[PDB]
Amino acid sequence: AQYEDGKQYTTLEKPVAGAPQVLEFFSFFCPHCYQFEEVLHISDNVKKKLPEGVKMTKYHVNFMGGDLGKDLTQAWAVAMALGVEDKVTVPLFEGVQKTQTIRSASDIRDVFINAGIKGEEYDAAWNSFVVKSLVAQQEKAAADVQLRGVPAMFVNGKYQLNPQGMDTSNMDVFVQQYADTVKYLSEK
């Protein structure tokens, strides 16, 4: 073909019923995830080429950064609940990986405070059961799919993107190729 299994994607032997249509995993500790977000804008460019009626999910994972890694997963759960994903993603990445000013839950909180969420509102979410179940969701979805590495993208719980089978000589070309693959997998 031009899109073959084992090339731009791989297939799960143990497909995941009821999975989100497009499901993405990252970690704020993950260098490629940083590139994927800050330089490549993968999520955004996939969305631009996805069909109508297709929803896009992105989850954080625990297996990077020990205790801070879990904190970040709860914090991402907070971001999802309050709908402030686009206001914290960048400062969280840069806080962990660029400036190294995130060393504790309190430092994570500051990013939300500086990005305008209010202390009371943040602390309330942080402690809410809605956020507990969003943390559970994030962990379940990772658990369902063999996940030991990020960044990772899954389509309909059957297909996993394989970026190491695409050209990286040109960034833009890499992105459109990545995105077009998601489109194809989507229609599959």
Task: CATH number of the domain at 85, please.
Answer: 3.40.30.10
Cα separations in angstroms, 177 against 15, 85, 121: 24, 25, 40
| Phi, psi dihedrals of residue 10, rounded to the nearest 5° | -130, 160
How many distinct structural domains can be found in the chain?
1
Would you say 152 and 25 are in contact if contact means Cβ atoms under 8 Å apart?
yes
Give the ranges where the chain is alpha helix by DSSP (H).
31-34, 42-49, 66-82, 85-93, 105-114, 119-127, 129-144, 171-187
The answer for residues whose C-beta is within 8 angstroms of residue 19's C-beta and 6 or more apart is: 141, 144, 145, 154, 156, 157
Assigned token pair, 32: 């490629």
C-alpha 148/C-alpha 128 separation (Å) is: 28
Cα separations in angstroms, 183 against 59, 77, 94, 139, 146: 20, 27, 30, 26, 23
- SS3 for 84? coil
Assigned token pair, 82: 């309050």
Range of the domain at 28: 1-188
Tell me how the structure was determined. X-ray
Residue 157's identity, in one-letter code, is G
C-alpha 139/C-alpha 141 separation (Å) is: 6
